[PDB]
Amino acid sequence: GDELYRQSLEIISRYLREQATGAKDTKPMGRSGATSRKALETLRRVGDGVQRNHETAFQGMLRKLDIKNEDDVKSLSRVMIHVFSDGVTNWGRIVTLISFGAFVAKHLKTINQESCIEPLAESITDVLVRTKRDWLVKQRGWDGFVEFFHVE
Numbered sequence: 800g801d802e803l804y805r806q807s808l809e810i811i812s813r814y815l816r817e818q819a820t821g822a823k824d825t826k827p828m829g830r831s832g833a834t835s836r837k838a839l840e841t842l843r844r845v846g847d848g849v850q851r852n853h854e855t856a857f858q859g860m861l862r863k864l865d866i867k868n869e870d871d872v873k874s875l876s877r878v879m880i881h882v883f884s885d886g887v888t889n890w891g892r893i894v895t896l897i898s899f900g901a902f903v904a905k906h907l908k909t910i911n912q913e914s915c916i917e918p919l920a921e922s923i924t925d926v927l928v929r930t931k932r933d934w935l936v937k938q939r940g941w942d943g944f945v946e947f948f949h950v951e
């Protein structure tokens with residue numbers, strides 16, 4: 800994964816953590832911090848929108864997932880792939896994946912399984928980067944992500 804993986808994990812982890820706790824993290828970004836911060840801002844905008852519009856579906860999937868513990872979270876990867884790996888690859892679906900990740904994170908905060916949020920992010924990142932790698936590189940990665948949702 801290297802740089803694309805590191806950057807993906809940092810963005811997804813910060814977004815899920817921020818979404819769960821309502822507090823902004825204060826530590827500096829590794830490399831290309833400018834792009835990670837821009838991607839995070841983009842994610843707050845479009846991701847909060849997708850969580851608002853897909854509330855019914857997100858609730859249904861979360862209920863279906865019956866997440867109660869570290870094992871339940873550790874078990875999600877094949878379900879993520881089950882939905883995500885079928886169909887067309889586009890930024891909207893990637894956003895659906897991450898923003899739903901945030902939704903689950905908020906739910907883990909509710910049941911005091913916040914420790915589970917970091918592996919969840921690690922799991923989402925692994926799913927995204929491993930399965931959609933060539934598509935992401937082709938799209939210029941997170942820079943492409945930002946440019947796709949740039950509101951001029």
Ligand SMILES: O=C(O)c1c(CCCOc2cccc3ccccc23)c2cccc3c2n1CCC3
Nearest residue numbers: 856860875878879882883892895896899900903
């Ligand atoms: O890939 C999609 O278009 C997609 C996605 C994104 C891919 C599947 O994402 C997940 C599926 C299962 C568990 C997940 C846990 C954390 C983050 C994402 C997870 C959806 C997520 C929740 C609900 C729906 C989702 N859809 C479409 C139908 C309704």
